[PDB]
Design an enzyme around this catalytic site. Structure first.
Site, PDB file in Angstrom:
ATOM      1  N   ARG A  96     -10.757   1.027  13.591  1.00 47.53           N
ATOM      2  CA  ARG A  96     -10.702   1.625  12.252  1.00 47.53           C
ATOM      3  C   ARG A  96     -11.828   1.084  11.372  1.00 47.53           C
ATOM      4  O   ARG A  96     -12.856   1.751  11.194  1.00 47.53           O
ATOM      5  CB  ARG A  96      -9.305   1.411  11.646  1.00 47.53           C
ATOM      6  CG  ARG A  96      -9.084   1.949  10.244  1.00 47.53           C
ATOM      7  CD  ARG A  96      -7.606   2.006   9.906  1.00 47.53           C
ATOM      8  NE  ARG A  96      -6.954   0.695   9.862  1.00 47.53           N
ATOM      9  CZ  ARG A  96      -5.693   0.509   9.467  1.00 47.53           C
ATOM     10  NH1 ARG A  96      -4.948   1.540   9.067  1.00 47.53           N
ATOM     11  NH2 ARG A  96      -5.163  -0.713   9.475  1.00 47.53           N
ATOM     12  N   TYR A 153      12.120  32.678   1.105  1.00 44.03           N
ATOM     13  CA  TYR A 153      10.890  33.406   1.384  1.00 44.03           C
ATOM     14  C   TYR A 153      10.831  33.965   2.799  1.00 44.03           C
ATOM     15  O   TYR A 153      11.189  33.302   3.757  1.00 44.03           O
ATOM     16  CB  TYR A 153       9.685  32.499   1.164  1.00 44.03           C
ATOM     17  CG  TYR A 153       9.373  32.189  -0.270  1.00 44.03           C
ATOM     18  CD1 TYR A 153       9.172  33.204  -1.204  1.00 44.03           C
ATOM     19  CD2 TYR A 153       9.241  30.871  -0.690  1.00 44.03           C
ATOM     20  CE1 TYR A 153       8.875  32.909  -2.519  1.00 44.03           C
ATOM     21  CE2 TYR A 153       8.942  30.576  -1.989  1.00 44.03           C
ATOM     22  CZ  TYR A 153       8.755  31.588  -2.898  1.00 44.03           C
ATOM     23  OH  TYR A 153       8.444  31.299  -4.211  1.00 44.03           O
ATOM     24  N   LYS A 162       0.835  -1.202   0.000  1.00 33.58           N
ATOM     25  CA  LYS A 162       0.000   0.000   0.000  1.00 33.58           C
ATOM     26  C   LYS A 162       0.874   1.259   0.000  1.00 33.58           C
ATOM     27  O   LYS A 162       2.064   1.223   0.378  1.00 33.58           O
ATOM     28  CB  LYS A 162      -0.956   0.003   1.187  1.00 33.58           C
ATOM     29  CG  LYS A 162      -0.266   0.117   2.504  1.00 33.58           C
ATOM     30  CD  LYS A 162      -1.170  -0.248   3.696  1.00 33.58           C
ATOM     31  CE  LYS A 162      -0.323  -0.250   4.985  1.00 33.58           C
ATOM     32  NZ  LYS A 162      -1.053  -0.354   6.285  1.00 33.58           N
ATOM     33  N   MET A 178       8.937  25.134  -3.043  1.00 40.64           N
ATOM     34  CA  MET A 178       8.178  24.042  -3.645  1.00 40.64           C
ATOM     35  C   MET A 178       9.097  23.009  -4.281  1.00 40.64           C
ATOM     36  O   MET A 178       8.841  21.809  -4.181  1.00 40.64           O
ATOM     37  CB  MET A 178       7.140  24.550  -4.663  1.00 40.64           C
ATOM     38  CG  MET A 178       6.203  23.439  -5.173  1.00 40.64           C
ATOM     39  SD  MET A 178       4.899  24.049  -6.278  1.00 40.64           S
ATOM     40  CE  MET A 178       3.842  24.891  -5.097  1.00 40.64           C
TER      41      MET A 178
HETATM   42  C1  LIG Z   1       6.541  29.446  -7.471  1.00 40.30           C
HETATM   43  C2  LIG Z   1       7.083  30.482  -8.426  1.00 40.30           C
HETATM   44  C3  LIG Z   1       6.184  31.379  -9.030  1.00 40.30           C
HETATM   45  C4  LIG Z   1       4.710  31.414  -8.709  1.00 40.30           C
HETATM   46  O1  LIG Z   1       4.434  32.076  -7.407  1.00 40.30           O
HETATM   47  P1  LIG Z   1       2.939  32.260  -6.796  1.00 40.30           P
HETATM   48  O2  LIG Z   1       3.124  32.868  -5.458  1.00 40.30           O
HETATM   49  O3  LIG Z   1       2.404  30.876  -6.704  1.00 40.30           O
HETATM   50  O4  LIG Z   1       2.250  33.120  -7.780  1.00 40.30           O
HETATM   51  C5  LIG Z   1       6.686  32.324  -9.917  1.00 40.30           C
HETATM   52  N1  LIG Z   1       8.027  32.344 -10.201  1.00 40.30           N
HETATM   53  C6  LIG Z   1       8.934  31.481  -9.621  1.00 40.30           C
HETATM   54  C7  LIG Z   1      10.411  31.552  -9.946  1.00 40.30           C
HETATM   55  C8  LIG Z   1       8.458  30.523  -8.727  1.00 40.30           C
HETATM   56  O5  LIG Z   1       9.258  29.733  -8.184  1.00 40.30           O
HETATM   57  C1  LIG Z   2      -0.330  -0.970   7.281  1.00 42.53           C
HETATM   58  C2  LIG Z   2      -0.896  -2.335   7.561  1.00 42.53           C
HETATM   59  C3  LIG Z   2      -0.063  -3.451   7.689  1.00 42.53           C
HETATM   60  C4  LIG Z   2       1.424  -3.316   7.639  1.00 42.53           C
HETATM   61  O1  LIG Z   2       1.934  -2.756   8.905  1.00 42.53           O
HETATM   62  P1  LIG Z   2       3.532  -2.581   9.168  1.00 42.53           P
HETATM   63  O2  LIG Z   2       3.654  -1.978  10.516  1.00 42.53           O
HETATM   64  O3  LIG Z   2       4.008  -1.704   8.059  1.00 42.53           O
HETATM   65  O4  LIG Z   2       4.073  -3.947   9.134  1.00 42.53           O
HETATM   66  C5  LIG Z   2      -0.623  -4.699   7.950  1.00 42.53           C
HETATM   67  N1  LIG Z   2      -1.994  -4.816   8.055  1.00 42.53           N
HETATM   68  C6  LIG Z   2      -2.840  -3.730   7.936  1.00 42.53           C
HETATM   69  C7  LIG Z   2      -4.320  -3.954   8.060  1.00 42.53           C
HETATM   70  C8  LIG Z   2      -2.298  -2.465   7.675  1.00 42.53           C
HETATM   71  O5  LIG Z   2      -3.017  -1.432   7.571  1.00 42.53           O
HETATM   72 CL   LIG Z   3      -7.906  -2.370  10.478  1.00 42.06          CL
END
Ligand SMILES: *Cc1c(COP(=O)(O)O)cnc(C)c1O
Ligand SMILES: *Cc1c(COP(=O)(O)O)cnc(C)c1O
Ligand SMILES: [Cl-]
Ligand SMILES: [Cl-]
Ligand SMILES: [Cl-]
Ligand SMILES: [Mg+2]
Ligand SMILES: [Mg+2]
Ligand SMILES: [Mg+2]
Ligand SMILES: [Mg+2]
Lengths: 387, 386
Positions: free
Chosen positions: A136, A268, A39, A315
């Site tokens: 759950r 920023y 998963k 980002m």
């Molecule tokens: C992320 C980014 C943008 C866009 O900025 P916004 O705040 O999402 O408008 C513009 N120019 C550069 C270089 C960026 O990294």
């Molecule tokens: C996530 C999950 C597992 C695996 O658990 P681990 O701790 O990663 O071994 C087994 N059974 C169910 C139902 C799960 O959600």
């Molecule tokens: Cl479960």
């Protein structure tokens, strides 16, 4: 080997996964099977390669969170059994049947709706989830089970394959709640006995329960985190029965380096200023990759030295304060080893106020994965090429 | 386009269209818009967002790294695309072959590109000047001179434009912005001093474009405002028009049960019921980008805010409801439901982060449903593609 065009990547060591599965297989009784739990994009390691190597290492079954994930595996030519562990909507009944995917089914209401949607010929496999204290999904009460079994009388196309529960506290040192769950699960099995149903194929144990407790192996165990080579928790790590081999590392490369004069701002909102003339490196990974803003101030590895992330994580990029100039293209390790230093996913999790599971599993689909077997690159998967 | 879990993102294409239209009509008629679609279009999906933004009057696209540009090219998008983030020199030929411009600003990059050039391709680039963001870009005059020197040996690199980026355009007070502006004008003066026309100049992100005079130059680069969200809470009252949020995130009640007093919910039993409580479960968790730090946040069920209880798991989380609801009941995590709205900013505030991070980190395993004129026009389920 899919091409990729940014020097930021995950490395998955398939030898590590193979070894972990092999070691768990040796540890449990010879008549107990392993579900390889893949998963969450195989906990960020990628559905298909992990499933394939786990099966090669002796796991016999797979488990996923929801039906679409199972279909990824089926389209890849995997024919091993697959169980969906999470809940599924009743509209999934015929598609799951057609693709030989078992669903977790545990509600009379689901059965009632499946009857309405059944194509009149498909047989769908299911496992009953009993909620013994995880809270759950799954059946909790005897009369609830009764009602569920009554609805199944009208649904001959639903075929029980197995029965399971899940532990909420197997990664805690003190074992009271685990013991309560075990006793409750045996009570729940006795309801099936009362109502004339063979559970057939019983499974309870996650990584933590498998690697700790006697008498909970039943017919099969469900291994996620330990297959990836990480401890279920920091508190049980010290006393695991053998060494787990971490499979995933995450790297990038110095994309820019510059000397920034004393007192100038970085990133920023100018949350960092240099204290002297400082070497500031930039790398092409950021929060869109899953490397979140809360990792500001965390120390990554460059030339086997721990160096801090400075200024706001953006980002797609973040900045690092280095002691010395380094060449462009210098390897920066975020999870993994450089020299005698190792940054575990757990150490990243701890700084982030979370758990290793979340760190690995949220590494974005836009980051390529490079798969290593016997030290050699055998596959590169870049999901951006696929979309 | 099929999907088999009742958890999805809805992207309202009208909202994006309207935002881009409103920005276009707000700025001067001779100023172009880059639609910034880095980070899977801030979680809205690269291709549909690029398409609608171009329809609305954007003329160019911007991404973080070359692979993102190739997603767009493969989808048949032909408009200019600029990579804003840094790129390794080995990208030179593939960028050229796919008509993608890269940000280039280092003599060392040019030196390496010369080694790796296939001998025929011509690549467009933009110079990034670092006027105070401290991220990438040329800072100093002598550094600029060395960069231009190195270009003498790389006649296959073609200048398309010049830009900088503001670090504090979303802050009320403007000192650092003004400082960057003055620094950038100085850097342009150096370029012009060295005999190079910058050709096509751009500086403004969403916040700068919506707030300030004299920074539109030839084009603006719009991310967050295109998606209908304010760059910050503090400048939200200063915005010239209403932004229309494009993204919402929904799931459905997958289980509902009445849990007796005192029983535990989820890993490590961090929540126990106070009385006999109605507990719902939904099929979304931290693998979807909905992180453990949102435990205790309130989501929307039947138009009411109700808390997430117990630890968020990989693929599921639980909710305490005041009353029973049927399986299939809509649960809204971001967006509108009945008499309620949860903004991405609200999620971000609870999470100790910013809206950008919330929306952009919604996993590729969640399907997106695209709405135009109140109708579904497209469904993209990336899991089907891999
Ligand atoms: C992320 C980014 C943008 C866009 O900025 P916004 O705040 O999402 O408008 C513009 N120019 C550069 C270089 C960026 O990294
Ligand atoms: C996530 C999950 C597992 C695996 O658990 P681990 O701790 O990663 O071994 C087994 N059974 C169910 C139902 C799960 O959600
Ligand atoms: Cl479960
Ligand atoms: Cl024991
Ligand atoms: Cl920048
Ligand atoms: Mg200065
Ligand atoms: Mg080295
Ligand atoms: Mg080996
Ligand atoms: Mg000349």
């Amino acid at each position: 080997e899919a091409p990729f065009y940014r020097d930021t990547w995950v490395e998955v060591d398939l030898d590590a996964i193979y070894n972990n599965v092999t070691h768990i297989k040796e540890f449990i009784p010879s008549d107990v099977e392993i579900f390889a739990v893949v998963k969450g994009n195989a906990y960020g390691h990628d559905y298909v390669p992990v499933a394939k190597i786990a099966l090669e290492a002796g796991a016999t079954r797979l488990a996923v969170a929801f039906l679409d994930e199972a279909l990824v595996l089926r389209r890849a030519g995997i024919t091993a059994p697959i169980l969906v562990l999470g809940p599924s909507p009743p509209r999934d009944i015929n598609v799951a049947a057609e693709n030989d995917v078992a669903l977790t089914v545990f509600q009379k209401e689901w059965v009632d709706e499946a009857i309405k949607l059944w194509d009149g010929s498909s047989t769908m496999k299911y496992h009953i989830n009993f909620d013994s204290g995880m809270g759950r999904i799954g059946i909790r009460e005897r009369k609830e089970l009764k009602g569920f079994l009554k609805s199944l009388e009208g649904a001959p196309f639903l075929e029980l394959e197995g029965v399971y529960t899940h532990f909420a506290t197997a990664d805690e040192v003190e074992t009271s709640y685990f013991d309560k769950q075990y006793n409750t699960f045996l009570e729940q099995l006795s309801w099936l006995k009362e109502f004339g149903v063979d559970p057939k194929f019983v499974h309870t144990a996650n990584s933590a329960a498998t690697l700790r407790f006697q008498g909970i192996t039943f017919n099969a165990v469900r291994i996620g985190i330990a297959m990836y080579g990480l401890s279920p928790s920091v508190e049980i790590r010290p006393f695991l029965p053998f060494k787990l081999e971490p499979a995933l590392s995450l790297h990038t490369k110095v994309a820019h380096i510059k000397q920034v004069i004393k007192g100038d701002g970085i990133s920023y909102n100018v949350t960092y200023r240099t204290k002297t003339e400082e070497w500031i490196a930039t790398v092409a990974i950021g929060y869109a990759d899953g490397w979140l803003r809360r990792l500001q101030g965390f120390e990554v590895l460059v030339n086997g030295k721990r160096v801090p992330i400075v200024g706001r994580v953006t980002m797609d990029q973040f900045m690092i304060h280095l002691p010395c100039e380094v060449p462009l293209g210098t390897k920066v390790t975020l999870i993994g080893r450089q020299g005698d230093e190792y940054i575990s996913a757990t150490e990243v999790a701890e700084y982030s106020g979370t758990i290793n599971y979340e760190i690995i599993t949220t590494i974005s689909f836009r980051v390529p994965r490079i798969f290593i077997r016997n030290g050699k690159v055998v596959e590169v998967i870049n999901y951006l090429n696929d979309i």
